[PDB]
Amino acid sequence: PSNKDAALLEAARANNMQEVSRLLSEGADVNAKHRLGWTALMVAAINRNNSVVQVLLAAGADPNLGDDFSSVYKTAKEQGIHSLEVLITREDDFNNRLNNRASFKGCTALHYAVLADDYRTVKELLDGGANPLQRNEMGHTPLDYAREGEVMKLLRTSEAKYQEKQRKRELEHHHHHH
């Protein structure tokens, strides 16, 4: 990606609030994508940077994009680079607390906030239009990745409300409200 998009991903990772705002005003893509597959919103979410998540959503970030990163091993093959570089970059530019063996293809920012078990980040994404029913490539919802506690309770409630809005054909009504 461009210099501005690359700086935005780093500022979103680093919780550098001033820089995120600056870069967006200079034309950085709010859906900026790392060469290895993830967005600024995803990396803000896994790092519990709920203030960065707020800013990106306000500038129009799509909450429902899925990660193109799969696993260290598979992504390394699909890109023709060695797994060592992929592992270091995933750990250094994204987050170092995830399972290196697992596949994350199709994970949304909400999947990642749930793995981070952060109530505030999860709530901000749900309030921002994140679809709690959207599954990743392995077929898991964000609630599938929740641990017991306040995030799992919030997701259970939100799933039921989202399903009811979908059945009543009124998702767009509620999206344009507070």
Author numbering: 131 to 308
Please share text taken word for word from the publication where this structure appeared.
ANKiso2 crystallized as a monomer and is a monomer in solution. However, to our surprise, the structure of ANKiso2 markedly differs from the structure of ANKiso1 and is entirely α-helical with the long β-hairpin undergoing a conformational switch. Unlike ANKiso1, the crystal structure of ANKiso2 closely resembles the predicted AlphaFold2 model and superimposes with a root mean square deviation of only 0.541 Å over 143 Cα atoms. Notably, the concave surface that was previously occupied by the α5 helix is now bound by the C-terminal helix of a symmetry-related neighboring ANKiso2 domain. Although the basal ATPase activity of SKD3iso2 is reduced by half compared to isoform-1, we found that the ability of SKD3iso2 to recover functional protein from amorphous FFL aggregates is >4-fold higher than that of SKD3, and comparable to levels observed with the more powerful Hsp104 bi-chaperone system, indicating that helix α5 may indeed repress the protein disaggregating activity of isoform-1.
SKD3, also known as CLPB, is a ring-forming, ATP-fueled protein disaggregase essential for preserving mitochondrial integrity and structure. Ankyrin repeats are one of the most abundant motifs found in eukaryotic proteins and the Ank domain is the defining feature that distinguishes mammalian SKD3 from microbial Hsp100 unfoldases. The two isoforms differ by a 30 amino acid stretch present in isoform-1 (exon-5), which represses the protein disaggregating activity of SKD3.
